[PDB]
Design a protein around this ligand. Structure first.
Ligand SMILES: C[N+](C)(C)CCO
Ligand SMILES: C[N+](C)(C)CCO
Lengths: 193, 192
């Protein structure tokens, strides 16, 4: 009843924030899209920053559930790492929108401590996932010996950089090109020769 | 009057870097300088014109800075390490520049004049890195691996690490980013 009103507001706000930008989304844009009042929205989220914070929290959870679903039947660490990286591509739809929002979060983080803390915890979880995957492939003998933390740092960084090049329209860049670049890095920098 | 626009842009640049473009109202610029929203619009008809002219000014200053630093350097390995050092978000001017760039990546995905400006700027920088790699390959100090893909890799790595710095990743610092990049150059670019 009320938890349902919240989720709908957040789902709508996420999409609007992704496609129009957080500072260009007004409360009445959300209320119009859903048929509610500005007052209902204010009741659940007294400030716009609260809509962003709670929308991010909901999405980090959705995204992690997606990850769990995609990987649970995968035991080979190369296949796991390949899938993990695939889940990070800004493919058409929800993943492209998530990227759109994360780019905004990088900036808003430099200014809002709750957003900064949420982004860091979400980042850290991913970072540990990557590092853990590396150490499994190392134990399985399919990945080269190398410090997994430095490698998780590098892979994560490479991914974010490439995504920017996709979103900002760098000439020759596409999701297929990013995919190819990242698969080349895995095959030549991570996989055991 | 060339002096009034100058002050406006330098002030707007600093406020955008520190407060964020969407949080800077026109009266905020006026108060930092002592003037009115009207005078500000007199020189910049829209808020978006302020961001655009400021960015143009910055891109130029940064390219100048780069030419001054690379001027004499013949050795490609040294040129490359210097190019990379210029991208570090060191406290003060460079960190402020990164802050604006971060906003520009987002505004690019929505505004064409800004996307155009960012792509011409990024392409210049990217070709520079490419060129330098090819130089070191010819001099014999760098591994003969496709320079476009290496430059794509190094540029992406730079952006990603900068983000980790600016957003506060645990254990991240400007010096750690420097070491990571130098290690990338030394172990991935330089010829064993
Ligand atoms: C790689 N992404 C930016 C999509 C997620 C980080 O949380
Ligand atoms: C973020 N950099 C400073 C690397 C370049 C932006 O034009």
């Amino acid at each position: 009843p009320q938890s349902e009103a919240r989720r709908r507001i957040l789902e709508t706000a996420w999409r609007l924030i992704a496609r129009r930008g957080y500072h260009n989304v007004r409360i009445h844009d959300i209320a119009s899209e859903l048929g509610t009042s500005n007052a209902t929205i204010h009741y659940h989220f007294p400030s716009k920053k609260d809509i962003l914070l709670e929308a991010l929290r909901r999405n980090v959870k959705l995204a992690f559930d997606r990850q769990v679903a995609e990987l649970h039947t995968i035991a080979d660490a190369r296949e796991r790492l390949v899938r993990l990286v695939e889940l990070q591509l800004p493919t058409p739809g929800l993943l492209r929108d998530e990227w759109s929002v994360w780019l905004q979060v990088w900036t808003e983080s430099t200014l809002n401590p709750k957003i900064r803390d949420l982004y860091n915890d979400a980042y850290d979880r991913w970072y540990q996932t990557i590092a853990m995957t590396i150490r499994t492939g190392q134990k399985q003998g399919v990945f080269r010996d190398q410090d997994a933390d430095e490698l998780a740092t590098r892979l994560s960084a490479l991914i974010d950089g490439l995504g920017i090049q996709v979103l900002t329209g760098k000439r020759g860049c596409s999701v297929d090109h990013m995919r190819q670049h990242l698969n080349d890095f895995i095959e030549h920098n991570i996989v055991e020769r």
